Amino acid sequence: INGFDLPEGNVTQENFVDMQQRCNASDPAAYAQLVFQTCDINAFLSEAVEGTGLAFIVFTEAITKMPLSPLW
Amino acid sequence: LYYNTIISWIMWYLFNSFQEPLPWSDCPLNENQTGYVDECARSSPVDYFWYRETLNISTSISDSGSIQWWML
Amino acid sequence: SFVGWSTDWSPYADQSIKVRISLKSALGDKAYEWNDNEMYLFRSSVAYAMRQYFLKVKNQMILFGEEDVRVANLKPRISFNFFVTAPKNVSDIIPRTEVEKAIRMSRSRINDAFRLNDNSLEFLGIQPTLGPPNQP
Amino acid sequence: SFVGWSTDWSPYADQSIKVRISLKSALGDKAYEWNDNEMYLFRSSVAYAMRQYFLKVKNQMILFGEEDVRVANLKPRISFNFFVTAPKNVSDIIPRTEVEKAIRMSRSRINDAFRLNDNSLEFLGIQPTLGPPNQP
Ligand SMILES: *[C@@H]1O[C@H](CO)[C@@H](O[C@@H]2O[C@H](CO)[C@@H](O)[C@H](O)[C@H]2NC(C)=O)[C@H](O)[C@H]1NC(C)=O
Ligand SMILES: *[C@@H]1O[C@H](CO)[C@@H](O[C@@H]2O[C@H](CO)[C@@H](O)[C@H](O)[C@H]2NC(C)=O)[C@H](O)[C@H]1NC(C)=O
Ligand SMILES: *[C@@H]1O[C@H](CO)[C@@H](O)[C@H](O)[C@H]1NC(C)=O
Ligand SMILES: *[C@@H]1O[C@H](CO)[C@@H](O)[C@H](O)[C@H]1NC(C)=O
Ligand SMILES: *[C@@H]1O[C@H](CO)[C@@H](O)[C@H](O)[C@H]1NC(C)=O
Ligand SMILES: *[C@@H]1O[C@H](CO)[C@@H](O)[C@H](O)[C@H]1NC(C)=O
Secondary structure, eight states: OOTTOOOOTTTTTTTSHHHHHHHHOTTTTTTTOOOOOOOTSSHHHHOOOOOOOHTSHHHHHHHHHHSSSOOO | OOOOHHHHHHHHHHHHOOOOOOTTSOOOBBBSSSSBOHHHHSSSHHHHHHHHHTHHHHHHOOOOOOOOTTOO | OOOOOOOOOOTTTTTOOEEEOOOOHHHHOOOOOOOOHHHHHHHHHHHHHHHHHHHHHSSOOOOOOGGGGEEEEOOOOOOEEEEEEEEEEEEOOOOOHHHHHHHHHHHHHHHEEEOOOOSSOSSSOOOOOOOOOOOO | OOOOOOOOTTSSSOOEEEEEEOHHHHHHOOOOOOOOOHHHHHHHHHHHHEEEEHHSSSSSOOOOOOOOGEEEEEEEEEEEEEEETTTEEEEEEHHHHHHHHHHHHSSSHHHHHOOOSSSEEOOOSOOOOOOOOOOO
């Protein structure tokens, strides 16, 4: 969106991959500087933290993104 | 002997509650208030509250320092 | 020499400031439509910001209008470049380093006219810096 | 007949809208100074409000500018009368009942440009009406 000038609510999760190829077929040499991520679940669920990190760097990070943070 | 040090770490995170911006929610500023602290930006802020503001950890088991008053 | 030309260079391009506006992230619902009347209010807000900077820093009274803010390259994602000239002298482009200081003074005032806050109205070369968090 | 004249009647007086601004009650401290640049932003905000009303109600595109908003009787307490004319026709004063409908549509937008809220920026003939309190 910051590289191809598209509306806001344009190119959501349902239409990521088809809008990847609509841009590179529209104009080449502007897709080559784009840095994308290969992030996917079963890689975010699969960290091997154990022993003290499951309460001090994993559980307390998910508490800050809840509604009432200093009560949970 | 060592399970009374884990409870020592647990009640340190209990004293640092009772404030709405939790101390493990955002990075501190360094000296000139223009950028973050360097290892809070490369790592996570929560990962920064454990190793530098709770433990003040060293790089090895050979290098040890003072008694670290708050923990005491 | 170089035979040929590139259709990207422009005589006003090195003094332009790119503005990028994301309306449906700062508001989502209850978000207004960006027609030509909203571009009029933006050009009068930049002309307000240039008037205050020349009065409170340089002690000059220069009557910038909304016709001195020249907007190019309008896109759907709400993007344009702009540059500010003298009020009745089209040859006299204000340099970019003084338009950046004028917007930095009144960025809190331009943001409130459009209900955006510093991340949905970004100026691409002007970043927010200030604010020390000394709570306790 | 009546021999003599009164120095209060004016040919633009029955189509004027009095604006009263109380800056040090909505802000108190952190309150800006009201110089001639703030009067420029007010005249461009009213000209923005007239542009949106003629587009979204009457489907006309009339390019009101800040020179079509004529401000008289400026006082220290921040008070003035204003009236809006046609863009290049000084004889064509917009009637007061349509300027009142134009400000009523965009009163939430004019208020946000000056950090006032509906009681420190009053228009003296335009009162806020809406809002039912159905909480439970
Ligand atoms: C409009 O602005 C330009 C500058 O952008 C003025 O041009 C200057 O003119 C003086 C004398 O005429 C020269 O000494 C300068 O070198 C010129 N500036 C540049 C950048 O070349 C021009 O005079 C202005 N016009 C008016 C009517 O004031
Ligand atoms: C400026 O506005 C006035 C109205 O305020 C216009 O005057 C009208 O002119 C037509 C024909 O010329 C008459 O039939 C109307 O009776 C006039 N109106 C009034 C209120 O007397 C005038 O034409 C406008 N000028 C321009 C150039 O459009
Ligand atoms: C994204 O843009 C395309 C291009 O016009 C449009 O057809 C589509 O409706 C847009 N998507 C959304 C969610 O607005
Ligand atoms: C656009 O880039 C992607 C990513 O490498 C590539 O797979 C695709 O083939 C490119 N499109 C064209 C038309 O080459
Ligand atoms: C950062 O702070 C140091 C002093 O701690 C100062 O010398 C330096 O100029 C500052 N950097 C910036 C960009 O302000
Ligand atoms: C521990 O913290 C103190 C300040 O509280 C600091 O001076 C010292 O360098 C820290 N220890 C290490 C190993 O960085």
